[PDB]
């Protein structure tokens, strides 16, 4: 039995070993409880506002669009404490762990940002946090690894399998299944077994609510399209949710195309992968033909999740959302362009979403359109990779 | 086929509990794997439990994670494991053979076709580690349609609702888990399982010494399964294949002997 | 003739070569004009809000103060676009350059942050920006140097004299004095020749106005003290100004004590330097006894300005403000402590101000007090220096 | 003393314009500096202009920034420069000697005491590069009290208000700047300056060839000052001290000759 639907059409579910179900049922229950509890909401609202900085601005970029008939706004999650949208849902998940009486937090991280984020929520809120990270990513994310540790978290490297995020995601589960009674598993994206895709969505949705209000305030009407990168789905579902019932509003998700779809070396399972069952759920997966899970590739470390949230696969299948891809070059061009014409260094991740907006504008410059891009994070962390590339080139 | 029902009845006429070791197919290589398996049988296993190497075995501990990696170092694929199974069934008629699968490998090229391929190589059961009863329908159906017994794990904290689902939906044997965590007080489940006419329980997770096999049977379980310990042996002996089989032999005999009246 | 007083008691003035005065008179005039112009104010308010993120939160830190009778709030300039308070005044100065019809911006920078800041304001607002930076700081601030250049600014290294910020400050002047007619000099602190200390103050004062409102909202009354680091004076005067007429409100400025006042190797000219005339003004200077200007030392690169704003020297001399110092160790302890108990990585600069608050609390834990610290920036940029120190140690 | 008034009157009786080179004291070293200075005189300078090395000479171009650095490489300090001045006055009675100072070095140990030390070594004027007329009071006072002429710069864009301040407040000569920028159509200022009985103007900044000295005098300026060019010569000859003095000699003679009737 669950209280909510664990499925978005055919995708989603709860595929975990039997020993973990009481944990997901308990979590679902505590989340359902929390959403009707005014104290919980007021406490969440208060950290998002006075600790994390909400609401985030909505920024019109006239320099980018000049000479065209696009108007473009970026929702500045790069301004949120922590530097990316992930801090929203971690605070919510932490209050949940609290509300369940758990005292420890477990989280997985690839590029480091969800690990930094769970460690900051943990420190603030009195939880003991341990983070799993694949040794390959450890090697290549020392800033992050040191940030989490300055914040009292313990960082545990994962050496098995490809040693990256999916292997962190396995190690997180293994641990949860023997400590769930005291620990809560702060999953890092809107993915995984129910009720996580729904709870991550609901704790990121303020991004779309505030967008809507702001755009109505500044323009008098809803956008023609909202665009967001899609690594595992949290920022995009966050920007989309509140516009889902607004049929005239385009939802465009951007998955990394890496060196190029035809090359194989990409991160776009929703449009170029194949349905599978992994990580607690049924969704598009990057996988071989025999069914082993493979890694996602992208010039940006954070769109590494080799699968995608179920709700996006559903949205796609019914037509209600559109998903496209943007290559590393395209995303680097968009990065450059923002730095030089609006003076915002966007994350390479959010670079993908900006890049598809710029294509929308450029390919048809006399089309009349009002776009919002979700600038899911800041790109300070990417300054050197862009540096090394522009040097080799 | 009814190999489990047959074994169970035979063992029950001997007043014996069942002893079933687990290995990963193709670890450390195919040939050596086939020899390990034959040695496990020749030493006394009542049934096998065999894993198909998978990239992301989120319910296993390190030991068996190394086993999959070694199997992958040697190129072993599912299509190879099935050929392995086939020659195992060819060599041994009556031994129940259960697979331990992860969901993706069964759902990959169509669920039904996975259970059909199981039937044509002679497999008797399949346990899918990351599909809970709540999500078992498609998998249990496809299983019964091809005569394979779908195995389920009964957790130590299982509540009565779950007990009944397991007893209703499983066949061949019931995997009685001794503990939470990953591979590395049961009297109640066991009585309740008999009460609901579950398939006979095999106690699993952490069985590594003969005393525990004996203790399981006394508790009322029809038997015990041991894998980590079996894999440990492999992983300890990689440098000498012959010593590998010899220690496998001795451990299995010791385990089997303990289930005896 | 000027329109406003160029002096704060004995300190300040306009000591520039005669050729630059028409430029400072013109600037003063344009600023006086702007402050009475509602269009200018509305345009400034709109970038601070929808481009820079204002207002910034005020954050209560219960974990830090537990067990004591201090209540501590940090004003989160670390959340402002750009990551530090400097973005406020640069946007104001840029609109000024605009209003004067200039098209080019000139700025000096030490640790990089004022250079990044002037380059982002420049990019947004259509100005051509060149930045002067001392070659020693160039060497040691590559991230910053590359950030400014991604944002279209030209970075010109200064090799003369100690090759650091003061030598950048000279090179800025030299250039202004031959291009002032098209270029505006975006000075980076509340220092230098009038009208800069007054204009930087007035374009940073929103930090104290919002603090006041927020603290009245959350606590019902004004703080007992506001504390802020003092590198050249802009963030602190920004936090102080609006509380100056509130006599019961303490203003405490924190200058870097470096390895220790007695050692000589510090950055605290206001309390441990000697009055001099340099950089367009009369104020406390780090200087030899014969009168050559020396460098300020500190573990944090941004408190390097070897002098201090005039208005702070005045405030100090009349008793209305207090100035203290905090050493590198003390500032590193405070850095650590914030990371681990509130999950905010503060800038080493703002670390000094937090450190003095913690002393206020620790030395008298049963005193009843409500403190605000101005967290002037984020410390992402300092992660490695703290790393290397904690490794050697 | 009245050395400037005296020189000017003498030059005026010769129908001559004045030629005054600038150097930094102690560049490249003290001894060599003293020899440079004597060579400048022996070659014909009418008055000297001497800088005291300072750390942050924000109104000078590279050339003279190198001069201060070389002077600092050699340890030269203000107290040393004053001893230098003293032996210069001892050697040459009547030559006007002006200093080019930065504010801090004059305000450092008390403004009044700086002008007093100027008087005791025999200095005649002091120009302080970063003190505009608007801020000149303390400096001009202290100057007149000790008989030193306070020099001011009249910028090319000077408006009538400024013209009058300069003419009122300066003494000895007026520094007529040829251009904005740092060290590296004047007829109106010059007439207006005469009109307000300013001290005689010396045209400065960028004078480096004899033609310009001649052009200044024709314009009505009582003379021209050249420093960058003089310093260039130094900096070009550091490897050979003797060639240094010889080229200094030739350039100065060439400059001086050009101011002649
Ligand atoms: O390692 C063991 O001791 C026992 N293992 C089994 O019975 C085989 C097994 C491998 N992975 C699993 C996941 C869930 C249930 C059984 C297994
Ligand atoms: O370099 C020159 O050509 C002329 N320089 C002078 O007349 C001496 C000088 C040095 N620095 C200055 C700053 C302002 C005015 C004169 C000077
Ligand atoms: C982590 C991250 C993402 C990708 O994860 P999502 O769940 O897909 O949003 C995207 N943008 C930024 C800045 C990220 O940090
Ligand atoms: C630049 C900076 C300072 C120092 O300059 P002020 O004018 O003294 O405020 C302080 N804190 C941060 C974060 C800075 O970037
Ligand atoms: Na993905
Ligand atoms: Na200072």
């Amino acid at each position: 039995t669950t209280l909510l639907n664990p499925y978005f059409g055919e995708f989603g579910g709860m595929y975990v070993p039997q020993i973990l179900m009481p944990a997901l049922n308990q979590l679902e229950e505590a989340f359902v409880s929390a959403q009707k509890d005014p104290e919980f909401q007021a406490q969440f609202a208060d950290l998002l506002k006075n600790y994390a900085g909400r609401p985030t601005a909505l920024t019109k970029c006239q320099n980018i669009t000049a000479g065209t008939r696009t108007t473009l706004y970026l929702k500045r999650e790069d301004l949120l404490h922590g530097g990316a949208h992930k801090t929203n849902q971690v605070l919510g998940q932490a209050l949940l762990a609290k509300r369940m009486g758990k005292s420890e937090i477990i989280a997985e991280t690839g590029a480091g940002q969800h690990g930094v984020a769970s460690a900051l929520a943990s420190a603030l809120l009195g939880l003991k946090c341990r983070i799993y990270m694949g040794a390959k990513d450890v090697e290549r994310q020392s800033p992050n690894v040191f940030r989490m540790r300055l914040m009292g978290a313990e960082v545990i490297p994962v050496h098995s399998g490809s040693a990256t995020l999916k292997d962190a995601c396995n190690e997180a589960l293994r641990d949860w299944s023997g400590s769930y009674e005291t620990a809560h598993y702060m999953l890092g994206t809107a993915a995984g077994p129910h009720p996580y895709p729904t709870i991550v969505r609901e704790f990121q949705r303020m991004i779309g609510e505030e967008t809507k209000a702001q755009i109505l305030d500044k323009e008098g009407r809803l956008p023609d399209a909202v665009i967001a990168c899609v690594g595992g789905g949290s920022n995009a579902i966050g920007m989309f949710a509140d516009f889902i019932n607004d049929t005239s509003v385009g939802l465009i998700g951007v998955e990394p195309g890496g060196h190029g779809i035809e090359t194989g070396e990409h991160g776009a399972p929703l449009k170029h992968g194949r349905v599978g069952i992994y990580f607690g759920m049924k969704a598009p997966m990057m996988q071989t033909a025999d069914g082993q899970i493979e890694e996602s590739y992208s010039i940006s470390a954070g769109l590494d999740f080799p699968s995608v949230g179920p709700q996006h696969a559903y949205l796609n299948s019914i037509g209600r959302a559109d998903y496209v891809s943007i290559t590393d070059d395209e995303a680097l061009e968009a990065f450059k362009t923002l730095c030089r014409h609006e003076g915002i260094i966007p994350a390479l991740e959010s670079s993908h979403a900006l890049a598809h907006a710029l294509k929308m504008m450029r390919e048809q410059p006399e089309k009349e359109q009002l776009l919002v891009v979700n600038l899911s994070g800041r790109g300070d962390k990417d300054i050197f990779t862009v540096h090394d590339i522009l040097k080799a080139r | 086929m009814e190999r489990y029902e047959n074994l169970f009845a035979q063992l029950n006429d001997r007043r014996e509990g069942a002893f079933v070791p687990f290995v990963t197919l193709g670890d450390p290589g195919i040939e050596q794997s086939l020899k390990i398996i034959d040695t496990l049988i020749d030493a006394g296993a009542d049934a096998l439990e065999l894993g198909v190497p998978f990239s992301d075995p989120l319910a296993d501990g390190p030991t068996i994670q190394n086993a999959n990696l070694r199997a992958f170092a040697a190129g072993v694929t599912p299509a190879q494991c099935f050929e392995m199974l086939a020659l195992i069934r060819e060599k041994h008629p009556t031994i129940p053979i259960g697979l331990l699968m992860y969901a993706n490998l069964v759902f990959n090229n169509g669920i039904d076709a996975f259970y059909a391929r199981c039937e044509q190589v002679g497999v008797d059961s399949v346990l899918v580690a990351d599909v809970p009863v709540e999500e078992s329908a498609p998998f249990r159906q496809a299983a019964l349609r091809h005569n394979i017994a779908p195995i389920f794990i009964c957790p130590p904290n299982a509540d009565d609702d779950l007990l009944r689902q397991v007893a209703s939906y499983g066949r061949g044997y019931t995997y009685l888990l001794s503990r939470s965590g990953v591979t590395g007080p049961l009297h109640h489940l066991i009585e309740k399982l008999k009460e609901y006419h579950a398939a006979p329980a095999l106690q699993g997770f952490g069985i590594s010494s003969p005393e525990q096999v004996s203790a399981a049977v006394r508790a009322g379980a029809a038997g015990a399964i041991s894998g980590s310990a079996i894999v440990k042996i492999i992983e300890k002996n990689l440098a000498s294949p012959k010593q590998m089989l010899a220690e496998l032999r001795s451990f299995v005999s010791a385990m089997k002997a303990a289930s005896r009246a």
Side-chain angles (χ1 to χ4, degrees), chain A, chain B residues 1-86 88-261:
Chain A
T1 328
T2 59
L3 304 164
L4 293 175
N5 195 338
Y7 287 96
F8 296 89
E10 169 193 332
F11 296 119
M14 302 182 67
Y15 298 86
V16 293
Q18 191 83 42
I19 185 70
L20 272 163
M21 293 285 309
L24 281 182
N25 292 150
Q26 163 195 47
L27 168 63
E28 187 188 36
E29 174 74 81
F31 159 69
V32 173
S33 181
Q35 297 295 104
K36 307 174 154 76
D37 169 11
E39 308 136 66
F40 179 99
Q41 299 298 318
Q43 180 161 213
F44 191 24
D46 160 64
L47 301 174
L48 287 170
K49 162 171 181 200
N50 295 311
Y51 174 90
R54 286 203 78 85
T56 49
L58 186 62
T59 289
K60 194 163 55 222
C61 289
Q62 301 184 30
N63 297 330
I64 282 306
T65 58
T68 74
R69 288 195 76 200
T70 288
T71 296
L72 174 55
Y73 279 90
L74 322 168
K75 177 55 156 165
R76 308 292 307 287
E77 293 308 296
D78 60 300
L79 302 166
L80 185 68
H81 173 58
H85 64 305
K86 286 179 176 62
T87 272
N88 295 319
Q89 73 101 356
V90 289
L91 279 167
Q93 278 205 62
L95 290 178
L96 263 188
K98 294 173 73 110
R99 173 180 190 87
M100 291 198 301
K102 306 287 159 95
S103 54
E104 320 196 289
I105 278 312
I106 283 160
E108 82 293 344
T109 198
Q113 180 72 24
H114 177 63
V116 178
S118 305
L120 64 89
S122 287
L124 181 66
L125 295 186
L127 301 154
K128 197 192 156 172
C129 179
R130 57 174 176 278
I131 303 199
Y132 285 112
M133 182 176 206
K136 306 187 186 164
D137 296 314
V138 174
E139 207 281 332
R140 59 191 179 194
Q141 303 290 352
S142 292
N144 295 334
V145 168
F146 185 50
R147 277 183 184 78
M148 302 160 231
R149 259 150 198 168
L150 278 170
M151 280 161 154
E154 193 189 345
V155 177
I156 302 161
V158 198
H159 303 286
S160 64
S162 52
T164 42
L165 170 61
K166 58 174 183 75
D167 322 288
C169 283
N170 309 332
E171 187 71 24
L173 292 155
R174 289 183 177 106
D175 175 349
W176 202 28
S177 59
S179 48
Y180 60 93
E181 295 173 300
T182 44
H184 167 71
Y185 173 30
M186 193 175 267
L187 205 150
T189 187
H194 171 88
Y196 287 96
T198 285
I199 286 169
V200 179
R201 182 202 58 238
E202 289 293 301
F203 282 171
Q204 279 289 21
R205 76 148 55 237
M206 50 290 304
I207 277 175
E209 307 170 343
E210 282 171 30
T211 294
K212 177 174 280 182
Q214 292 164 305
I215 196 87
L216 285 181
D217 175 68
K218 282 148 156 232
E219 302 279 339
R221 64 181 206 84
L222 296 164
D224 303 310
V226 294
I227 291 114
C229 50
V230 166
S234 54
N235 89 265
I237 208 62
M239 162 68 249
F240 286 4
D242 197 59
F243 287 108
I244 276 161
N245 300 142
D246 296 299
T247 57
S248 83
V249 171
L251 309 179
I252 295 179
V254 187
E255 282 192 300
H259 288 316
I261 298 314
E262 56 309 307
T263 65
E265 254 157 54
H266 60 72
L270 195 174
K271 290 294 295 300
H272 298 288
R274 178 161 70 72
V275 188
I277 298 181
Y278 166 65
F279 197 45
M281 66 178 192
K282 182 171 295 165
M285 274 322 138
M286 305 284 292
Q287 57 176 318
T288 61
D290 261 341
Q292 301 301 355
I293 318 292
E294 281 180 327
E295 294 169 266
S296 265
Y297 171 82
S298 172
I299 182 180
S300 137
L303 292 188
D304 49 347
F305 188 57
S307 171
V308 60
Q311 183 176 9
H312 287 283
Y314 173 65
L315 289 171
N316 178 54
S317 74
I318 55 175
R320 179 48 191 100
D322 289 315
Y323 294 85
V324 283
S325 56
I326 278 294
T327 66
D328 295 347
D329 295 347
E330 295 170 316
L332 284 170
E333 193 276 318
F335 179 95
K336 296 205 286 170
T337 285
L338 201 64
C339 278
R340 162 78 181 107
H341 293 280
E342 299 293 341
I344 316 174
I345 310 182
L348 284 168
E349 286 88 342
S350 318
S351 288
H352 279 77
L354 178 57
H356 180 69
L358 286 175
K359 196 187 281 187
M360 283 165 75
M361 178 172 78
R362 293 166 179 164
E363 280 190 353
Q364 316 179 302
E366 296 349 286
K367 184 177 174 180
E368 196 181 336
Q369 49 196 326
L370 174 63
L371 315 197
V372 183
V373 156
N374 196 194
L375 190 84
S376 53
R378 37 163 183 267
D380 288 307
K381 58 180 186 61
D382 292 318
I383 252 89
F384 289 138
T385 275
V386 166
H387 188 275
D388 299 334
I389 290 139
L390 303 172
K391 169 189 200 157
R393 279 173 197 186
Chain B
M1 305 307 266
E2 269 175 324
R3 285 190 179 84
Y4 276 113
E5 299 59 40
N6 284 173
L7 184 60
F8 283 133
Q10 300 154 25
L11 283 154
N12 185 271
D13 176 74
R14 332 192 283 263
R15 293 166 178 216
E16 200 151 297
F19 169 64
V20 175
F22 157 99
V23 288
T24 295
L25 293 167
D27 164 23
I30 292 158
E31 322 230 304
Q32 170 82 354
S33 174
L34 295 156
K35 281 185 186 58
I36 284 163
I37 293 147
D38 278 342
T39 284
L40 291 191
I41 297 187
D42 188 67
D46 297 293
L48 306 178
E49 217 215 356
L50 312 173
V52 174
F54 171 55
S55 43
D56 293 287
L58 60 74
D60 281 285
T63 289
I64 286 186
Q65 308 160 12
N66 281 53
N68 290 287
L69 238 279
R70 287 188 302 274
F72 279 135
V76 167
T77 56
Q80 275 157 18
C81 286
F82 268 97
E83 287 162 30
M84 276 186 90
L85 289 162
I88 298 155
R89 177 49 75 195
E90 289 166 311
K91 290 191 294 187
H92 303 275
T94 68
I95 198 176
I97 278 163
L99 300 170
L100 183 276
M101 277 322 298
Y102 276 84
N104 200 51
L105 280 176
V106 164
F107 168 88
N108 192 71
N109 310 122
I111 289 172
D112 193 74
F114 179 85
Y115 283 95
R117 180 62 181 144
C118 288
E119 168 174 43
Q120 144 186 72
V121 298
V123 148
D124 316 278
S125 77
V126 159
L127 201 188
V128 199
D130 41 346
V131 165
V133 293
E134 295 84 339
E135 288 287 9
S136 51
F139 289 91
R140 61 194 214 254
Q141 304 137 25
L144 295 164
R145 281 196 301 278
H146 291 93
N147 312 299
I148 296 309
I151 315 267
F152 296 110
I153 289 195
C154 176
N157 58 316
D159 82 308
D160 192 68
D161 281 8
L162 179 52
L163 299 147
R164 298 164 179 271
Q165 264 169 288
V166 187
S168 186
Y169 292 171
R171 289 269 178 306
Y173 63 89
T174 297
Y175 198 104
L176 178 60
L177 194 67
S178 52
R179 75 167 157 72
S180 79
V182 289
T183 61
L186 294 164
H187 294 78
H188 199 209
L189 298 40
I190 304 163
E191 287 317 297
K192 263 171 160 191
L193 311 153
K194 276 175 192 193
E195 200 194 315
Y196 305 127
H197 300 81
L202 309 170
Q203 187 181 325
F205 278 44
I207 304 313
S208 55
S209 70
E211 330 170 36
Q212 279 163 298
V213 174
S214 73
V217 194
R218 204 126 74 238
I225 279 165
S226 188
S228 298
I230 293 276
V231 190
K232 278 167 204 346
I233 295 170
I234 293 164
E235 165 195 322
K236 289 172 205 174
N237 299 289
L238 290 164
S240 21
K242 280 176 209 160
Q243 213 187 292
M244 197 192 289
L245 301 167
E247 264 184 61
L248 282 186
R249 186 170 287 265
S250 290
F251 180 64
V252 158
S253 210
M255 306 292 284
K256 173 53 211 167
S259 58
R260 276 196 201 98

